Design a binder for these strands. Structure first.
Lengths: 171, 226, 121, 133, 237, 109, 54
RNA sequence: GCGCACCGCGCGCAGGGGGGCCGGCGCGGCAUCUGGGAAGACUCCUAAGGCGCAAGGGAAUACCCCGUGCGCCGGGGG
């Protein structure tokens, strides 16, 4: 009933993390997004917790990561500070596609902040943001199909039914 | 602003461009049935949408966004069909679209022209564009480089036969491309044929007359007899 | 493959192209494989950009050895003909490499650019 | 308490604080064949001649650190004694290679650094013709 | 004039305007890579005046982290003529020639390298210098050369990799003596080009500290390299 | 231009040589402690001209080499910009004496 | 807290320290947390806290 | 803790440690905002004319002016 373990790869501050879902059977890994950008990949096999490696880091230094969720086995989604939603493939570590959001035309501070992303069980991606919208990204080509206005202030969390039929937005 | 817009050839919809660049530009779809907002296609970019055109049926519309992304975004599904790339042009400025018996599920238009900032203007074929799965790198039908500055008018003989494409920044940048053979003409326009600094072109609906106009604000006209 | 400092990140690539374009207007940029290698051997260079999709990649594989020796960063774009008409010459440059001077905002942009490349490493 | 050791030359067993047995070998190209054989974990005649006791598995153990060679010599049915992997046998293997000075006159009162460097040269030559020139 | 340095095996050539580091050439009459060399004899050959016996290869700060740290003021190298040092990242086999000259024949240096061209000239140098053995392998798999490498005393490590701490840790655990010596280079750009280099240096210090060494000293190599730290640490003592 | 480049290369090599010589002539060090007691013990243990002339000479030499180098660099850049104002079609770079930047938005077809 | 370093001016003498995070939990970066709260209330302002009080 | 007052606080000085973390300096970030460079080719790019290269003459002589030869752009016109 206390801290089993700690682990630390050298970077800025870890802000969002999740484990790879199943499709191997015993090779499952943590994926953690942090302040400065670098997706770090952590290894947990047989009661271990150790920094495996760095997948990549974002190009710029102001790209802050806030939200993380897994579309599939190999396909990670991060939502990030400069109004962007990056779809990375983890295995190679490459950048499958950069989704992008526009300016928050209510208040100032141009760069919108994706606050929370999840993926629906049939693969589309849903993303609560800083203008309180909720985007429906078609997930095959990783772009938008709907922009729903939900709250007044910004979304803070999403949740989904497991069959993919009830989406809950928390603002 | 409501500066740029294009109307469906079916004449029911209109597409306005949102002046808000920020990582990706969007264009709203407005019914001219009732001038109402009914759709908002969003494409990624680095500055927003250069140009776009209505497919000839009307069902979808092709969005050429700067840094050469081409979204093809349906209407009946009202979600993006496919994404592909102009063959490595730094900044797309103009596109347009025409032709006949192109693939019907992309609306049935045939040739699609894309004009860079750098001046090079490519011409692609959409029955070649299909790999629904799209070819992410169409090797272009041709990569025309007679012109040397940033392309401003790219327009089509609405019988899908002639291509006019012309740069404004230098005097007399108007070149004329025959299709589907994709060979640029020689005998026109000559050194002494009075174009100017071409700013807008338009063929007739019958495609017998061509009209061209320049920074002095004057119109010239040419019969097109083959 | 061998192009291990690959740069596919889109805004990164666009910043690289635009910086090359600005540098092409400032004459501080050398166009072509052979000239790139001359510039690095003479040491004047400060960054070098290549193209991944050449068909025999080996004609540019000799550059990373020299630049590892003489210590200048190098990085691959994915599209040669994009690089070429980024220079503005209409023929697909496969290798461009751009150098330093004393006082230029372009020199500053270069320094931030190589910082981005060292991030990508 | 059957241990599996392997130097550049041969093997030894220390099942009874002090050493129990050994086997030596010198100066062949079957040395680098053995090197590939322990690279993968395959059958080795040296290995078979060591594991060929005649009674039974009297205790079902053969401590060898590497899991790949462990679960390969599981797959050999020549003696059907079962190995155990490196269950953090680091004090074990590190200590035996450090205290290997006591082992030298026990089986090979000599130096085999010359054959070890011959091995390294041969296999590195195999590696740089694996990446030929 | 040549004098042995405070560190044994090492020598300094002093003149009116220069002070150079040099080692006794194991193979006299031969230059590995275009290094300078001076011949000095011991006195007692006055009527002849030919410097015959000792050949000293002039070592370079601008090619080698190890005595770069020494000239920065490294107090202890942990090694001597007669030692056993494993080299990590035998870049072009030059510093490894130097440390083989230090350890002499009685000392035995084991060099690993993963890149193949560096490996080519590695084995080509090793054809001359006998007290080194080359292994062309990715040291992230030490269990390939565990058969080849005996127990050692000192680990030198310069490998441009992100998991530098992890590699040196598993390799120490597989080969380092109790109370072993470690001389290790950290290149902050290679590890993380973002945080302050002092901070990330201290980070790797903590990593080896939990990796059961004892960080003795750490110097910056910046009359010589840029963003480079040499760390001397002991293991289990 | 070719002449200027050769002399530039030679002087660059010379600055390399002189820099090496200057450095070899001439928060840096961290010593770690288990506890402040051993820190104090080490504190107790620590409690227990020709170079100047040759270095000043060396410094003046290397500074002069840097000056000649940079002059050669400027020469290289200057002739590159004369080249830009003497290419066979309109080409970018270099200032006019009126102060403007020449900036042709063309492409050399 | 930790003892500060004693520099001779040329070098530095400090004491190693990891006796802070024994088995409980790591202490947060106050900077990072305030950054998060900034990103939450980017520009916007607080209302009066409670009521009639000095 | 030393010398000064053995009818006294105190002062001159060595420094051990920790503290207000009061105030400055340094380094980092920083969703906004000011400022400045570069900047989109529809945007300005000096105007119906520029600009360069080399010569020639004249000068507050570090600086510049001026219409002989080659190029390179532009407008107008067509």
């Amino acid at each position: 009933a206390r801290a089993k373990k700690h682990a630390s790869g050298q970077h800025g501050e870890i802000w969002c993390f999740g484990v790879q879902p199943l499709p191997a059977a015993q090779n499952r890994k943590l994926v953690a997004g942090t302040v400065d950008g670098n997706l770090v990949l952590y290894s947990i096999e047989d009661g271990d917790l150790k920094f495996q490696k760095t997948l990549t880091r974002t190009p710029s230094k102001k790209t802050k990561f806030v939200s993380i969720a897994f579309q599939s086995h190999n396909i990670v989604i991060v939502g990030c500070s400069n109004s962007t939603i990056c779809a990375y493939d983890v295995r190679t570590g490459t950048m499958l596609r950069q989704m992008t959001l526009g300016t928050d035309l209510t208040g100032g501070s141009k760069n919108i902040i994706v606050w929370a992303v999840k993926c629906l069980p049939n693969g589309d991606i849903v993303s609560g943001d800083s203008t309180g919208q909720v985007c429906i990204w078609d997930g095959k080509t990783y772009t938008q199909a709907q922009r729903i206005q939900s709250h007044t202030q910004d979304v803070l969390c999403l949740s989904v039914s497991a069959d993919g039929s009830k989406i809950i937005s928390g603002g | 602003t409501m500066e740029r817009f294009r109307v469906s050839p079916c004449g029911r919809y209109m597409a306005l461009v949102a002046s808000d660049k920020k990582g990706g530009g969007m264009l709203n779809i407005i019914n001219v049935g009732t001038m109402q907002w009914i759709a908002q296609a969003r494409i990624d970019g680095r500055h927003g949408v250069a140009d776009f055109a209505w497919w000839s049926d009307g069902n979808g519309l092709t969005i050429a966004g700067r840094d050469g992304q081409v979204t093809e975004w349906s209407m009946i599904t009202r979600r993006t069909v496919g994404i592909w790339r102009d063959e490595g042009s730094i900044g797309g400025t103009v596109m347009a679209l025409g032709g006949r018996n192109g693939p019907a599920e992309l609306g049935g238009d045939r040739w699609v022209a894309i004009g860079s900032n750098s001046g090079i203007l490519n011409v692609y074929d959409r029955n070649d564009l299909i790999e629904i799965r799209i070819k992410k790198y169409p090797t272009p039908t041709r990569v025309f480089e007679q012109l040397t500055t940033s392309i401003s008018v790219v327009a089509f003989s609405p019988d899908g036969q002639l291509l006019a494409f012309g740069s404004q920044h230098k005097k007399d940048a108007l070149r004329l491309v025959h299709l589907p053979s994709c060979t640029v003409y020689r005998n026109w326009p000559t050194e002494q044929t009075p174009l100017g600094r071409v700013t807008a072109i338009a063929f007739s609906s019958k495609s017998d007359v061509l009209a061209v106009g320049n920074d002095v604000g004057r119109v010239r006209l040419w019969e097109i007899r083959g | 493959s061998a192009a291990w400092p690959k740069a596919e990140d889109p805004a990164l690539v666009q910043e690289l192209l635009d910086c090359v374009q600005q540098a092409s207007h400032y004459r501080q940029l050398k166009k072509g494989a052979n000239e790139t290698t001359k510039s690095v051997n003479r040491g004047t260079s400060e960054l070098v950009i290549l193209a991944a999709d050449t068909q025999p990649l080996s004609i540019v594989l000799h550059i990373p050895l020299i630049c590892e020796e003489k210590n200048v960063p190098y990085v691959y774009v994915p599209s040669k003909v994009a690089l070429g008409r980024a220079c503005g010459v209409s023929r697909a440059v496969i290798a461009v490499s751009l150098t330093s001077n004393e006082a230029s905002d372009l020199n500053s942009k270069i320094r931030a650019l190589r910082d981005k490349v060292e991030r990508l490493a | 308490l059957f241990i599996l050791t392997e130097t550049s030359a041969g093997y030894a067993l220390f099942k009874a604080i002090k050493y129990k047995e050994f086997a030596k070998f010198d100066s062949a190209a079957i040395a680098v064949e053995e090197a590939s054989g322990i690279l993968e974990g395959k059958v080795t005649p040296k290995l078979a001649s060591l594991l060929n006791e005649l009674k039974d598995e009297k205790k079902v153990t053969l401590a060898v650190h590497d899991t790949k060679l462990s679960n390969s010599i599981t797959k050999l049915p020549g003696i059907n004694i079962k190995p155990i992997s490196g269950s953090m046998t680091d004090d074990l293997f590190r200590a035996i290679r450090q205290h290997l000075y006591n082992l030298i006159p026990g089986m090979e009162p000599s130096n085999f650094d010359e054959m070890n460097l011959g091995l390294a040269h041969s296999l590195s030559r195999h590696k740089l013709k694996f990446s030929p020139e | 004039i040549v004098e042995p340095h405070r560190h044994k095996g090492v020598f300094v050539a002093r003149g009116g305007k220069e002070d150079l580091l040099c080692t006794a050439n194991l193979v006299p009459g031969e230059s590995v890579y275009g290094e300078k060399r001076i011949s000095v004899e011991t006195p007692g050959s006055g009527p002849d005046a030919v410097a015959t016996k000792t050949e000293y290869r002039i070592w370079n700060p601008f090619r080698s982290k190890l005595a770069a740290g020494i000239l920065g003021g490294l107090e202890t190298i942990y090694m001597k003529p007669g030692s056993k040092v494993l080299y990590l990242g035998a870049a072009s086999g030059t510093s490894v020639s130097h440390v083989a000259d230090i350890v002499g024949p009685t000392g035995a240096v084991y060099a690993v390298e993963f890149s193949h061209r560096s490996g080519r000239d590695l084995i080509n140098m090793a054809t001359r210098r006998t007290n080194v053995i080359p292994i062309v392998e990715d040291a992230r798999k030490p269990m390939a050369y565990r058969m080849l490498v005996p127990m050692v005393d000192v680990i030198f490590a310069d490998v441009a990799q992100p998991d530098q701490a992890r590699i040196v840790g598993i390799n120490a655990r597989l080969f380092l003596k109790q109370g072993g010596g470690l001389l290790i280079s950290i290149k902050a750009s290679c590890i993380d080009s973002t945080a302050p280099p002092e901070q990330v240096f201290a980070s790797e210090v903590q990593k080896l500290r939990e990796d059961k060494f004892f960080p003795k000293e750490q110097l910056t190599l910046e009359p010589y390299e840029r963003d480079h730290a040499m760390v001397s640490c002991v293991y289990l003592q | 231009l070719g002449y200027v480049r050769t002399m530039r290369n030679i002087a660059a090599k010379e600055l390399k040589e002189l820099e090496e010589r200057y450095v070899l002539a001439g928060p840096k060090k961290i010593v770690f402690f288990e506890g402040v007691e051993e820190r104090q013990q080490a504190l107790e243990k620590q409690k227990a001209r020709r170079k100047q002339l040759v270095l000043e000479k060396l410094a003046r030499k290397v500074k002069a080499a840097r000056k000649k180098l940079k002059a050669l660099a400027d020469a290289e850049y200057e002739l590159e910009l004369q080249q830009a104002k003497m290419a066979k079609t309109a080409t970018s770079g270099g200032f006019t004496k009126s102060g403007r930047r020449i900036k042709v938005r063309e492409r050399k077809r | 807290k930790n003892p500060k370093d004693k520099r001779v001016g040329s070098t530095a003498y400090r004491v190693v320290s990891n006796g802070g995070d024994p088995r409980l939990a790591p202490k947060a970066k106050k900077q990072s947390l305030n950054l998060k709260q900034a990103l939450l209330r980017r520009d916007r302002v607080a209302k009066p806290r409670g009521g009639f009080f000095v």
